[PDB]
C-alpha cells in the first residue's frame, strides 16, 4: 500500500499562511523527490514545488508564481512533506496533490503517486452557515409514475457542503448540483427522484457544513 | 515556461470506438511526455510515460506516441472505465507543466429532459426572499436553454444556472436553475414558468405553476 496523506487545508484571508503536511507510506521516503502539485477550474493543474533528495542536490524547485513565499520542506525521520504558504493569493487556491516525481531509476519528473489532496481557499469572506429550504411539488400537479423532490442549500461559505438523502439510505435518481458563487456566498440546489407511492410515507435531505459546525435536515412536506 | 495545448478540451465517443487525445508543446521536449487519467471525484493518475511507456497497470489498448511538439494518446476499443479527464504534461525540465485537459465523455442515444419546478418554500419568504428552481434532468446531449417567464414575461434577470458532470450510472447530464426575486415582486405576479430548450424536441418542455391557487 503506497499512500500520500495530504492534511493542512482550509479558509485563510489573502496575506495570511498556511501549511500543509503529507504522510507517505508504503516506500523508502528518504529515496524519493516529492511534489506539491494544485488544481483549479480556472488554471487547470499546475506543478507548485518540488523537493529531491536534501541536501546534496540543488533540492527545492518552484514554480515561478510561488517564488519567495513557498517553502516546500522534508522530515524524513516522521517520513513526510510540508508545504509552508506565505502571503497567499486568491489563485493558489484549488486542491493540493502531494505526488512523487522520483524513487529509482533514470527517469523522473512525472508523478507517479498521487494523494488524495487537501482544499486551500483564499478569501476575505467570512464563514457563513447556510439556509436549508425544502423544495415541495405544486398542489395541481397531476403525478406522473415518477416524483421530484428537492433541497435548496442557500447563502453559506466556505465550500464545501455535504448533501445526503435520508441519512444516505437514499443514492439513486439524485442530482448534488455544483454551487454557484454570488456575492461573496455560495447557493447549491439537490433533487431526488422516487415512484410517486413512496411520497409521502418519509424523505428528507441532509446538510453538513463542517466550517461553520451545523448540521441541518428538513423533511419534504408537500402542500 | 514551456506551453501545453490539448485538443480537444471536450470531446464524446461510443464505447468500442477508438479516439485520439493531441497534445502540442511551445518547443521541443523530444520524448519527455507523461499522460494521466483523472476519474470523476479522483486525483490524477499515471498513463504513460516517456511519450510511449505505459505505467503498471495500464492495459495495452493504451498507445501514446510522437515526439519533439505533437504528441498523441490513442485509446482501441473504448470501455466503460477509460471515460474521464486526461491531461498530459513534459518530464524535460522544471518547471514542469501540464495541459488544460480533455473530458472524454460518453456517447449514448438523446434522452429528453425530465423538467421540474419548485415554488419558493415558505420558511425562505420569511427571510425576505424567494428562489424559484427548475430542474432539467436526466438529458442527452449537454446542450440545453432555459427560459424563465413570470406572468407570461421573460426574464433573464435573477437565474443562476449550474451543470452536473455526465452522470456515471446512465451517461446523462442533469441541469438546475434558479431564479431569485425579492419576495415582494414574487408576490405580484400569478403565474411563474420554465421551459427547456432541448435538441430532443421542436417545441420546448414547459412546466409552471399558478401562485394563486
Known amino acids: 500500500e503506497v499512500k500520500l496523506e495530504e492534511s493542512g487545508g482550509g479558509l485563510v484571508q489573502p496575506g495570511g499562511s498556511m501549511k500543509l503536511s503529507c504522510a507517505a507510506s508504503?516506500?523508502?521516503?528518504?529515496?524519493?523527490?516529492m511534489d506539491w502539485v494544485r488544481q483549479s477550474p480556472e488554471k487547470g493543474l499546475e506543478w507548485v514545488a518540488e523537493?529531491?533528495?536534501?541536501?546534496?542536490?540543488?533540492?527545492?524547485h518552484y514554480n515561478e508564481s510561488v517564488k519567495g513565499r513557498f517553502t516546500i520542506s522534508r522530515d524524513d525521520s516522521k517520513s513526510s512533506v510540508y508545504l509552508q504558504m506565505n502571503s497567499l493569493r486568491a489563485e493558489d487556491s484549488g486542491i493540493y496533490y502531494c505526488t512523487r516525481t522520483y524513487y529509482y531509476g533514470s527517469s523522473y519528473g512525472y508523478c507517479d503517486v498521487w494523494g488524495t489532496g487537501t482544499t486551500v481557499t483564499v478569501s476575505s469572506a467570512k464563514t457563513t452557515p447556510p439556509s436549508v429550504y425544502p423544495l415541495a411539488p405544486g398542489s395541481a400537479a397531476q403525478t406522473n409514475s415518477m416524483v421530484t423532490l428537492g433541497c435548496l442549500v442557500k447563502g453559506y461559505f466556505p465550500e464545501p457542503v455535504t448533501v445526503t438523502w435520508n441519512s444516505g439510505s437514499l443514492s439513486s435518481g439524485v442530482h448534488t448540483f455544483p454551487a454557484v458563487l454570488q456575492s461573496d456566498l455560495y447557493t447549491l440546489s439537490s433533487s431526488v427522484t422516487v415512484p410517486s407511492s413512496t411520497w409521502p410515507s418519509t424523505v428528507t435531505c441532509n446538510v453538513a457544513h463542517p466550517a461553520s459546525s451545523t448540521k441541518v435536515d428538513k423533511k419534504i412536506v408537500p402542500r | 515556461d514551456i506551453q501545453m495545448t490539448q485538443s480537444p478540451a471536450s470531446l464524446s465517443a461510443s464505447v468500442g470506438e477508438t479516439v485520439t487525445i493531441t497534445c502540442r508543446t511551445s518547443?521541443?521536449?523530444?520524448?519527455?511526455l507523461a499522460w494521466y487519467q483523472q476519474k470523476q471525484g479522483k486525483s490524477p493518475q499515471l498513463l504513460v510515460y516517456n511519450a510511449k511507456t505505459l505505467a503498471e497497470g495500464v492495459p495495452s489498448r493504451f498507445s501514446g506516441s510522437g515526439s519533439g511538439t505533437q504528441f498523441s494518446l490513442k485509446i482501441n476499443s473504448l470501455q466503460p472505465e477509460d471515460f474521464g479527464s486526461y491531461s498530459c504534461?513534459?518530464?524535460?525540465?522544471?518547471?514542469?507543466?501540464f495541459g488544460g485537459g480533455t473530458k472524454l465523455e460518453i456517447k449514448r442515444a438523446d434522452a429528453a429532459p425530465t423538467v421540474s419546478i419548485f415554488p419558493p418554500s415558505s420558511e425562505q419568504l420569511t427571510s425576505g426572499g424567494a428562489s424559484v428552481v427548475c430542474f432539467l434532468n436526466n438529458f442527452y446531449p449537454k446542450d440545453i436553454n432555459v427560459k424563465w417567464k413570470i406572468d407570461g414575461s421573460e426574464r433573464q434577470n435573477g437565474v443562476l444556472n449550474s451543470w452536473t458532470d455526465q452522470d456515471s450510472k446512465d451517461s446523462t447530464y442533469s441541469m438546475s436553475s434558479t431564479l431569485t426575486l425579492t419576495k415582494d415582486e414574487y408576490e405580484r405576479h400569478n403565474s411563474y414558468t420554465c421551459e427547456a430548450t432541448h435538441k430532443t424536441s421542436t417545441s420546448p418542455i414547459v412546466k409552471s405553476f399558478n401562485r394563486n391557487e
Open positions: 508504503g516506500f523508502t521516503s528518504s529515496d524519493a523527490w
Open positions: 504534461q513534459h518530464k524535460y525540465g522544471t518547471p514542469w507543466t
Open positions: 518547443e521541443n521536449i523530444y520524448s519527455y
Open positions: 523537493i529531491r533528495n536534501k541536501a546534496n542536490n540543488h533540492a527545492r
